[PDB]
Design a protein around this nucleic acid. Structure first.
Ligand SMILES: Nc1nc2c(ncn2[C@@H]2O[C@H](COP(=O)(O)OP(=O)(O)CP(=O)(O)O)[C@@H](O)[C@H]2O)c(=O)[nH]1
Ligand code: MET
Ligand SMILES: [Mg+2]
Lengths: 117, 267, 95, 470
RNA sequence: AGCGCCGUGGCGCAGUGGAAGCGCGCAGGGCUCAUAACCCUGAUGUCCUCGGAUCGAAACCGAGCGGCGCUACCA
C-alpha cells in the first residue's frame, strides 16, 4: 500500500574531449538524477582524479586528456559507495551532516551510514 | 625622515652578513642597496650570484625585493662594497634573515620617536640604541627587557626625557605580548576519595594565583589535568607550578591514591 | 573541402575506444559491440587515427568478431553526421 | 499557534508527569510493578543478540528511542566494545474498543504516566504495563567477553536474523547457546529483513529458522517479522514482551550485591574543578536494594603485584552519593536493572576500561576473592561461530594442563590456567582476581582460531580464598 | 565537549604587523627541422567572518563560523 512502485536512471555519460581539454557538460543532469549536489560530486572527481578544474554555465572543464572509460568507472564506483545505499537498494538517500563528520543519511528507510573518505 | 645605520659604523665589515634590496641589474650583475647597513650601494657580479647554473637571470633576482647577502671586500675610501649571494649556507640564511628582522623592527620605533620630536634618527641611534646593543647584544632584546625591567635604561643619556616617556608609551603599546606556561598532571589514583581531593587540590592551586599571574587547572580528561598560567617574566610560572605539584602530591599521598607528573611546566 | 562518405550495406560507423598496438585498434561499433578492428591499407601510415574520433569500419561477413577500419572522420563530418543522425545519438563525441 | 514544546509540556502535565520517589516507603509491600517502582525505573533486562552488521541498535532505537551512542572515532562505524542502553516504557491502551495488536506502545523514559493514544479516533489514555531496560550487545567474533557478561546481566532475549542472507548464521547460534548456558529460556525471534524479501522467500527463511531451532533448549520461542528502519510492528513486539516474559522471582529478602559492567567518570571538560561530580560505576544489581547514603565496597578492587610478584587485592570502599536510573534521580534502586552508582570513587578509577566485570558488596557482607577456583565444567560436541566450507564442524577438544582459557564468571573477565583436568572437574588459577558470592554462572572459551571461541559451561564448587587487606 | 592548528590566485607554501605574495598549474610567443625539457611574458583573489588597539592591518588580540589531529564519548 505505501510503496506500490516497489537505479536504471544513470545518464549516458557524455565525455566531451577537446584535445588537451576535457568537458563534462551533462554533470548537472547526473547530479540531479542521483540526488547529489554537484559540489560534492566535483570534489569526489578531484579526489579520485588528481587534477583541478573550473565550473561554468552546470559544466565542468578540466584541461586534461582522459577517457570516458575511467569517467564511467569512477561514476559507477561513486554510485556504489555514495548514491546507492549499502543496506537497502535505494537512491532516496542524500548527503547531510550530524559533530563535524559528513554523515549521509537515508530517506526511503532512514538508516544511519557514513561515506566520507 | 627614514635613514641612518642599524649597526655601529656606516661601512660594512669584512666577512660579515647583510640583507640587501635589489633595484637594478645592468650587465655585469646587480649593484644594490643594503637594508642591514646604512643605504650605500654594493655590487654582486654574475659569477657570485646563483649557486645553480646561471639559467634564470630575472627570476632569481626579482628586481625590487629583498634577499640575504654576504660582503667580501670593503673600499674604505669612497663607499664601494663587493658582495655576493651564493656564499651563504642553508644553516646561515636563517640567522641572516633573523638578524635583518630584528634590525628592521628596532628601526621603526625610533623612526616614530624621531618624527615626533624632529630629532635626527642618527642621534637617537647614537644615544639610546647603540649603548643598548652594546649592553645586551641587540636593541630589541633591550626593549623586551624595558617592558619587563625599567633598569635597562639606567645609564643611557637621552637627548630629552620626553623621548624616554613617549618611547615607554610606544614600546608598551607596540611590543606587548607573558608566555603561557602549561603542564600536564597524571592522576593515577585507585583510592576511595578522589573527587574531593581534586577539589581541595585546585582550591590550593588557584589560591596561589597572584594579581599579575593567575593559575587555573582546567579539566580536559580524568587522569590528565592541564595546568595553564601566563608568566610575564618566564621565570615564576615554573616555581608556582612546582608549588601546585607539591600541593597535589601532599593532598593525595594521604587520601590513599597515587598521582604522578606527565609534563612539567614549560613555555 | 572534400565531401564526406556515407555508409553502405556492411560498412558502419564506430568510435575508437582505445587504439591497440602493432597496428590494431578497438572500435566500439555503433551497434552495441566493442569490436576489434585492423588499420587497413590506404590508411596505415598516412592518416593518423587518434583515440576518441569517429570513423568508418567495414565489417566482414565471415568474421563478426573482427573488422577493418576504412575511412576516418576528422570530427567535422562526424559532427555533421551526428546532426543528421547516422549514429545512435546518446554517445555524443565532440571537442 | 502553540509551539510543539508547549504542547508536549501540557501533555506531560496532563499525562501524570514524572513522580518523585517517596523517601521511605514500605519495602516488603513494594512489587516490581508498583507505581513508585514502575514509572521511574526499568525492572526487567531485555537484550538483543545477532550477527555483526545487521542492526541491533537500530531495532532498539526504533523501539524505545534512546540512542546507543556508538562512540570512539573508528568505533562509530565498525564495532563497539561497550554495551548499548535504552529505556523503554511499555504502554497499553485501556480502551477495549481499539484492537489489541496496536494497543501497546513503547515510549521513551521521559514519557508521562498516561500519554494519550496516538491512534486516530482513540481518546483513551495509555497505561504503563512495565518499564524495561535494553542491553545492546555487540555481536562480533572478536568480542566475546562483553557478550557473555551482558548475557549474565540479561533476563530475556531477542535474537535477530536477516532475511536475504544465509540462514544458519553461526554467531546467532553461538549467542543463543550462550543464553541457554546462563539460565535464560525466554527468547523472542525477529526477522529483521522482510521488506526486501518475497512472500515465498520469507516462508523459506521461516522454515529454515524452525529447522534450526529443534535441538536447542529453547523450543517454543515466538517468531516475529519486524522492520528496524521502516519503524513498524513494535506494538506487537511489546505485546510479546508482556506475554512471554513474566517477572523473574525477585524480592528484597536477598542480601545486597552489585555487579559493575561499565565504568563512567563524570568530568565535563571546560568547567572549573570547584564544581565537579563523583565517579560512576555502571552496574547491574541482580540482588539487593540500594539507597542514598549507603557505603559499598568493590571487592576485587585495587589489583597490585608485590615485589615478589604476589597478587594483592585492596577492596574499593565507597559511599553512595547518587543512584541514577532511567531519567530522574531516584531514592531507591530496583534490583534487576542497569543503574549508575555515582559514588565518591576517584574519577580516574573509572576512566574507560577499569570497572568492567567487577562484583561489589554493600556493607554488611564479605564476599571472597579466590586465587584457585575448581570448576564443574561441561562441553558441547562442535564449535559455534566457525564456518567450515562443506565439512564437519570443529569438535571441542578436552582441556590440557597449563593452558589459558577465557573464563567469564558472570561478568568477571579472567584468563585462567588449568592445573589439572578430570572427568567432570577442573582446577583453574587466575591472574586477574575474581570473587565468588553464591555460585555465579560461568562461561568457558578457548583460543584455537586466533580469537576466543565459546566451548561450554562451568560452575565453581570450591576454591582457595585470599583474605583482603583492610 | 575541550585542547593544537588552519582558513589561498586553480593546488601547494608563506610571512604576519608598511598592505597581493612564489612554485606547480594554464594561455601566449621564444629555442628547436619538429615534440618534449628549458626561456621569458599574462588574466584571475573577500589570505574565513564580526570587531577592538594602531599613522597602518590579511597581520596583535578578543566572539563568532567552517575543516581538521589528539584528549575521549568523558552518569
Ligand atoms: N535494510 C535494512 N537495514 C537495516 C536494518 N536494520 C539495520 N539496518 C542497517 O544495518 C546496518 C548495521 O546497523 P548497526 O545497528 O550499527 O549494527 P550493530 O549491531 O551495531 C554491529 P554488531 O552486530 O557488531 O554489534 C545499519 O546501517 C542499519 O541501518 C533493517 O532492518 N533493514
Ligand atoms: C539507567 S540510566 C543509564 C545508566 C546510568 N544511570 C547513566 O546515566
Ligand atoms: Mg551497540
Amino acid at each position: 500500500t505505501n510503496n506500490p512502485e516497489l537505479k536504471f536512471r544513470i545518464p549516458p555519460p557524455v565525455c566531451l574531449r577537446d584535445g588537451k581539454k576535457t568537458i563534462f557538460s551533462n554533470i548537472q543532469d547526473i547530479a540531479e538524477k542521483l540526488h547529489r549536489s554537484p559540489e560534492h560530486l566535483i570534489q569526489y572527481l578531484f579526489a579520485e582524479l588528481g587534477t583541478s578544474g573550473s565550473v561554468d554555465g552546470k559544466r565542468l572543464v578540466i584541461k586534461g586528456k582522459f577517457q570516458s572509460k575511467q569517467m564511467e568507472n569512477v561514476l559507477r564506483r561513486y554510485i556504489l559507495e555514495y548514491v546507492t545505499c549499502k543496506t537497502c537498494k535505494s537512491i532516496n538517500t542524500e548527503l547531510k551532516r550530524e559533530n563535524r563528520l559528513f554523515f549521509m543519511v537515508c530517506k526511503s528507510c532512514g538508516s544511519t551510514r557514513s561515506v566520507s573518505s | 625622515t627614514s635613514h641612518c645605520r642599524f649597526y655601529e659604523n656606516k661601512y660594512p665589515e669584512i666577512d660579515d652578513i647583510v640583507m640587501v634590496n635589489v633595484q637594478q641589474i645592468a650587465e655585469m650583475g646587480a649593484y644594490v642597496k643594503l637594508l642591514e647597513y646604512d643605504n650605500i650601494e654594493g655590487m654582486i657580479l654574475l659569477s657570485e650570484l646563483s649557486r645553480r647554473r646561471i639559467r634564470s637571470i630575472q627570476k632569481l633576482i626579482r628586481v625590487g625585493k629583498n634577499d640575504v647577502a654576504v660582503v667580501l671586500r670593503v673600499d674604505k675610501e669612497k663607499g664601494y662594497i663587493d658582495l655576493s649571494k651564493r656564499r651563504v649556507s642553508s644553516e646561515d640564511i636563517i640567522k641572516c634573515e633573523e638578524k635583518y628582522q630584528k634590525s628592521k623592527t628596532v628601526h621603526s620605533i625610533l623612526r616614530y620617536c624621531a618624527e615626533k620630536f624632529q630629532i635626527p634618527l642618527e642621534e637617537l641611534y647614537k644615544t639610546i640604541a647603540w649603548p643598548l646593543s652594546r649592553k645586551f647584544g641587540h636593541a630589541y632584546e633591550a626593549f623586551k627587557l624595558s617592558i619587563i625591567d625599567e633598569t635597562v635604561w639606567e645609564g643611557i643619556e637621552p637627548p630629552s626625557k620626553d623621548v624616554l616617556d613617549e618611547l615607554k608609551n610606544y614600546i608598551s603599546k607596540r611590543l606587548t605580548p607573558a608566555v603561557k606556561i602549561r603542564a600536564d598532571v597524571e592522576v593515577s589514583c585507585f583510592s576511595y576519595e578522589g573527587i574531593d581531593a581534586i577539589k581541595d587540590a585546585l582550591k590550593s592551586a588557584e589560591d596561589m594565583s597572584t594579581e599579575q599571574m593567575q593559575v587555573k587547572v582546567k579539566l580536559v580528561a580524568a587522569p590528565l589535568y592541564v595546568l595553564t598560567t601566563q608568566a610575564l617574566d618566564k621565570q615564576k610560572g615554573i616555581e608556582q607550578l612546582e608549588s601546585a605539584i607539591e600541593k597535589i602530591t601532599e593532598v593525595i599521598t594521604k587520601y590513599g591514591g597515587v598521582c604522578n607528573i606527565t609534563m612539567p611546566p614549560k613555555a | 573541402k572534400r565531401e564526406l562518405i556515407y555508409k553502405e550495406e556492411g560498412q558502419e560507423y564506430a568510435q575508437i575506444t582505445k587504439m591497440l598496438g602493432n597496428g590494431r585498434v578497438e572500435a566500439s561499433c555503433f551497434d552495441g559491440n566493442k569490436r576489434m578492428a585492423h588499420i587497413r591499407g590506404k590508411l596505415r601510415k598516412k592518416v593518423w587515427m587518434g583515440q576518441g574520433d569517429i570513423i568508418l569500419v567495414s565489417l566482414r561477413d565471415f568474421q563478426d568478431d573482427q573488422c577493418d577500419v576504412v575511412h576516418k572522420y576528422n570530427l567535422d563530418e562526424a559532427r555533421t553526421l551526428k546532426n543528421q543522425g547516422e549514429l545512435p545519438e546518446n554517445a555524443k563525441i565532440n571537442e | 499557534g502553540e509551539t510543539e514544546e508547549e504542547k508536549r509540556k501540557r501533555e506531560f502535565e496532563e499525562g501524570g508527569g514524572l513522580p518523585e520517589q517517596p523517601l521511605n516507603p514500605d519495602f516488603s509491600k513494594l512489587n516490581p510493578l508498583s507505581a513508585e517502582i514502575i514509572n521511574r525505573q526499568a525492572t526487567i533486562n531485555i537484550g538483543t543478540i545477532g550477527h555483526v552488521a545487521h542492526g541491533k541498535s537500530t531495532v532498539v532505537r526504533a523501539i524505545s528511542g534512546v540512542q546507543t551512542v556508538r562512540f570512539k572515532d573508528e568505533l562509530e562505524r565498525n564495532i563497539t566494545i561497550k554495551l548499548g542502553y535504552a529505556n523503554a516504557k511499555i504502554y497499553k491502551c485501556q480502551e477495549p474498543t481499539c484492537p489489541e495488536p496496536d494497543c501497546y506502545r513503547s515510549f521513551k523514559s521521559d514519557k508521562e504516566i498516561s500519554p494519550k493514544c496516538q491512534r486516530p479516533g482513540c481518546p483513551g489514555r495509555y497505561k504503563l504495563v512495565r518499564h524495561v531496560s535494553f542491553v545492546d550487545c555487540p555481536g562480533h567474533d572478536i568480542l566475546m567477553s562483553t557478550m557473555l557478561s551482558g548475557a549474565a546481566v540479561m533476563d530475556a532475549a531477542l535474537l535477530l536474523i536477516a532475511g536475504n542472507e544465509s540462514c544458519p548464521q553461526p554467531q546467532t547460534s553461538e549467542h543463543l547457546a550462550a543464553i541457554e548456558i546462563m539460565k535464560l529460556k525466554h527468547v523472542i525471534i525477529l526477522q529483521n529483513k522482510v521488506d526486501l524479501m518475497r512472500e515465498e522467500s520469507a516462508l523459506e527463511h521461516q522454515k529454515s529458522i524452525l529447522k534450526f531451532i529443534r535441538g536447542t533448549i529453547a523450543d517454543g520461542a515466538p517468531i516475529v517479522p519486524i522492520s528496524a528502519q521502516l519503524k513498524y510492528n513494535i506494538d506487537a513486539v511489546n505485546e510479546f514482551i508482556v506475554k512471554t516474559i513474566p517477572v523473574p522471582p525477585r524480592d528484597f529478602m536477598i542480601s545486597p550485591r552489585l555487579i559493575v559492567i561499565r565504568s563512567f567518570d563524570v568530568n565535563k571538560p571546560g568547567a572549573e574543578i570547584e564544581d565537579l561530580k563523583g565517579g560512576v560505576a555502571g552496574g547491574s544489581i541482580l540482588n539487593g536494594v540500594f539507597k542514598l547514603g549507603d557505603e559499598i565496597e568493590i571487592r576485587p578492587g585495587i589489583v597490585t603485584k608485590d615485589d615478589k610478584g604476589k597478587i594483592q587485592c585492596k577492596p574499593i570502599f565507597s559511599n553512595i552519593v547518587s543512584l541514577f536510573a532511567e531519567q530522574n534521580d531516584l531514592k531507591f534502586a530496583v534490583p534487576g536493572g542497569l543503574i549508575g552508582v555515582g559514588t565518591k570513587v576517584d574519577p580516574t578509577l573509572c576512566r574507560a576500561d577499569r570497572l568492567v566485570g567487577q562484583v561489589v558488596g554493600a556493607k554488611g557482607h564479605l564476599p571472597n576473592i579466590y586465587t584457585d577456583i575448581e570448576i564443574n565444567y561441561f562441553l558441547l560436541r562442535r564449535l559455534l561461530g566457525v564456518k567450515t566450507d562443506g565439512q564437519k564442524q570443529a569438535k571441542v577438544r578436552k582441556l590440557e594442563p597449563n593452558e589459558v582459557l577465557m573464563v567469564n564468571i558472570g561478568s568477571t573477565a579472567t584468563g585462567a590456567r588449568v592445573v589439572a583436568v578430570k572427568a567432570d572437574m577442573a582446577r583453574l588459577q587466575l591472574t586477574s582476581p575474581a570473587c565468588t558470592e553464591i555460585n555465579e554462572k560461568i562461561a568457558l572459551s578457548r583460543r584455537i582460531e586466533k580469537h576466543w571461541r565459546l566451548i561450554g559451561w562451568a560452575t565453581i564448587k570450591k576454591g582457595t580464598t585470599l583474605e583482603p587487606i583492610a
